[PDB]
């Protein structure tokens, strides 16, 4: 659900 | 032999503290595998 | 200053005792986290 | 009574350093759950 | 395979 | 990428 950097394909893992 | 042994104490110390901010630091990123493994369970069921 | 420094030792277990426990805890969802990613993994190969 | 508060040390000593060797264990699965988990996001998308 | 909570969609993973 | 035991079906997880 929310979170994940706000999406980005994952933002890498929302930067580690 | 008692500051010898406090030196000890506080090099002990100062590990835990490591070791703890570590645990942190692991924690924090393990709940980021499983907010992974959630969406890509929601994205595809 | 015997009891002092025992006093500390007793803190210092203390704190090590939850170290320990956190660490069982995080081991076990980390399981859980692989069960997961294999069971994702097979339900779509 | 500095022999038994050393032999002590020992102790904690000896369990922080099974502490470390097993947060290094821990790190390292954590890292395959998190290439696991880029691997099926991508080998999907 | 064995286990999830035996199932329910992954039991919010078998509760934590 | 680069990784899982080069393949093998993820190789049990490289081997734990």
């Given at each position: 659900x929310g979170x994940x950097x706000x999406x980005x394909x994952x933002x890498x893992x929302x930067x580690x | 032999?008692?500051?010898?042994?406090?030196?000890k104490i506080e090099e002990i110390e100062s590990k835990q503290?490591?070791?703890e901010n570590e645990i942190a630091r692991?924690?924090?990123l393990?709940?980021?595998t499983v907010w992974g493994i959630k969406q890509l369970?929601?994205?595809?069921?």
């Open positions: - | 032999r008692m500051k010898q042994i406090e030196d503290k490591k070791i692991i924690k924090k393990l709940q980021l369970q929601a994205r595809i069921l």
